[PDB]
Amino acid sequence: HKCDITLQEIIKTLNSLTEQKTLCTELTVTDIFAASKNTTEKETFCRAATVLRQFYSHHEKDTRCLGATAQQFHRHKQLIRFLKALDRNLWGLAGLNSCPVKEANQSTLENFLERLKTIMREKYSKCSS
């Protein structure tokens, strides 16, 4: 369970998300990693899944994000697609739907994905010889 390939599914999704600039990757999410490290692994995934869900719900039809061009509209749809896939995988990992996230700090979505990526790669590394 712990070292399941969902880890890889999440990482590969993170690679696509961070190699991807849009109009709205600088918009913010609550920085659940501004905590002082106080929670289990399932709480962490649940919290990450929560704030990402917050983001895609709120920015899927956001006029600031939707795009003028074909390419901008394509990239926005891509992003929302990848957040949902990531989110799906995080929730599957979390095994938990209810978890209060209490942080004041916001980071850009972009910074938050890089941080989640680091942690995910660390989990994988810890699993692997």
Author numbering: 1 to 129
Task: Copy text verbatim from the article accompanying this structure deposition.
Signal transduction of IL-4 is mediated by a sequential binding process, initiated first by binding of IL-4 to its high-affinity single membrane spanning receptor chain IL-4Rα.
This is in line with the observation that residues in Cluster III do not generally contribute to the overall binding. In particular, the dissociation rate constant is only increased by a factor less than 1.3, showing that the hydrogen-bonding network of Arg85 with IL-4Rα provides no free binding energy. To exclude the possibility that structural changes in addition to the removal of the Arg85 side chain play a role in the changes in binding stability, we determined the structures of the IL-4 variants R85A, T13D-R85A and F82D-R85A. No changes in the local structure around residues Thr/Asp13, Phe/Asp82 or Arg85 could be observed (data not shown).
